[PDB]
Each structure stands twice: as structure tokens, then as C-alpha cells.
Design a protein around this ligand. Structure first.
Ligand SMILES: [Hg+2]
Ligand SMILES: [Zn+2]
Length: 258
């Protein structure tokens, strides 16, 4: 049947339909801070989101996506471990049913309440579809979310969730500025990996920010009211839509800081 996060179609079953689930550069991974290699040659990250143009927000039955107009260099990522310019196409979240779980990557085994993924594709390849055929086709910016004070720049997303409660629904979502989701510091860890949901393609250069952002309990609660199911089907709350840590194998995690 279709993949998901339930006992019968969850992460442990994915390999039957996507053999790459057992590949050599799968994500997410646990970030062991004492084994990460400080690399002084790593350049600072360059996030240029001033001309970003959001279009829609959609519930796809797994998570919700905020999609951006990527027809021009409006919101791009460059610098850091990257060569070339990467265009923002969408961002989504992974969260848990409880505050002690929800993130995909863990730091020294610690799980955060959620994890934000800002997906970008290498412009050298023309479109997203071509990008996913290359080892360096994608760049994902990962931001941990912890429960504390409210993130003002997240409320606009929180407010629209009502209208896209079920699988397949979408709503126009223009003029959203993704800079309001960024932490103060841009220090990060980086390693080569993959998408964390099928097709689990190994085309991603992961950039995980060290500093997490805080969101209120009320903000995260609203994410948990979403539905995995389509309307007219038995209610199945969209929670725990995260994949467990995968073996690091022959990879090294590099830190941009000491
Ligand atoms: Hg690839
Ligand atoms: Zn993700």
C-alpha cells in the first residue's frame, strides 16, 4: 500500500518499495558533536531570501508544504559547503505527538520537538526533476525547533492550518517571508545524505544549523491537529511523521565552528 508512518507502512517497510532505503548515504543521522570535524576552510552560509515569493500551502497526506516560485533566483542559498547557487522550492516540517520527539536528525542522541526543512535545488541542473538525478543536486537547510517562547514569524503558517486539515487540500499562501524562521546564528554541521521521505534519493548536501528556534506549545499543538487522511475518511492525526536515524557508514560530519 502507500508508504506512511504507521506500523504497517512505516519507515521499517520502505525498503521493499524503495531499496535505496538501505543505501550508503541515507538520512537522517545522529550528529555526534565530539566526532564532528571542525573544518576551518568551510565558508560562511549565504541565505538570500529577500525576494522570496511564496504561492501555496498544501497538505500532501504526510506533511504540509509551503511552495515558492522558483522560476528565478528569488530566494537562494550559497556559500557554506556549497558550490553553485541553490534555489528554494519548498519547506516543510516533521514533528512528534509529544514534545520529546519530532526531529529527524538528533544531536548527541537528543531529539527536538520538530525539524524544519528548507529544500533547494542546484540551478546548474535547470529544474528540480533534473537536480534529483545528481549527487549534488539538492541542498537542505535543517532547523531544530524547541518548545519555549512563540516564534512570531511562524504564526502566519499556524493560522492557515485550519483550511488544509486533510490530505489533498491547499490554500493560497502569498507574501510569506521565510527569514522569520531563521535562528540568530548560522553555524552548522554538514554531511552528504538523502531525502528523508520516499523516494529517499541520495542527492542531498545537508546543512543542519546548530542553534534551534523556539516555538510555543500552542504553536506546535496546531501542527498536531492536521490529518493524514483525506476528508470523509476516519480521522488519523498527522503526528510522528519523522524517520529514525540511519547508519552513518563511510561519512564524516563537518562543523563550521569550534
Ligand atoms: Hg541523486
Ligand atoms: Zn523533511
Amino acid at each position: 500500500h502507500h508508504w506512511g508512518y504507521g506500523k504497517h507502512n512505516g519507515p521499517e517497510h520502505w525498503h521493499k518499495d524503495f531499496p535505496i532505503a538501505k543505501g550508503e548515504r541515507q538520512s537522517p543521522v545522529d550528529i555526534d558533536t565530539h566526532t564532528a570535524k571542525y573544518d576551518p576552510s568551510l565558508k560562511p552560509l549565504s541565505v538570500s531570501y529577500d525576494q522570496a515569493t511564496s504561492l501555496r500551502i498544501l497538505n500532501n497526506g504526510h506533511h504540509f508544504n509551503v511552495e515558492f516560485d522558483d522560476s528565478q533566483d528569488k530566494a537562494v542559498l550559497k556559500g557554506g559547503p556549497l558550490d553553485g547557487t541553490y534555489r528554494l522550492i519548498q519547506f516543510h516540517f516533521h514533528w512528534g505527538s509529544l514534545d520529546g520527539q519530532g526531529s529527524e536528525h538528533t544531536v548527541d542522541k537528543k531529539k527536538y520537538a520538530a525539524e524544519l526543512h528548507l529544500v533547494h535545488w542546484n540551478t546548474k541542473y535547470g529544474d528540480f526533476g533534473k537536480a534529483v538525478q545528481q549527487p549534488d543536486g539538492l541542498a537542505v537547510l535543517g532547523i531544530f525547533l524547541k518548545v519555549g517562547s512563540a516564534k512570531p514569524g511562524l504564526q502566519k503558517v499556524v493560522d492557515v492550518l485550519d483550511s488544509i486539515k486533510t490530505k489533498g487540500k491547499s490554500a493560497d499562501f502569498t507574501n510569506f517571508d521565510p527569514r522569520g524562521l531563521l535562528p540568530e546564528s548560522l553555524d552548522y554541521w554538514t554531511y552528504p545524505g538523502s531525502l528523508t521521505t520516499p523516494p529517499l534519493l541520495e542527492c542531498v548536501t545537508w546543512i543542519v544549523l546548530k542553534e534551534p528556534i523556539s516555538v510555543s506549545s500552542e504553536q506546535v499543538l496546531k501542527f498536531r491537529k492536521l490529518n493524514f487522511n483525506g476528508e470523509g475518511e476516519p480521522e488519523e492525526l498527522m503526528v510522528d511523521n519523522w524517520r529514525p536515524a540511519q547508519p552513518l557508514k563511510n561519512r564524516q560530519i563537518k562543523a563550521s565552528f569550534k
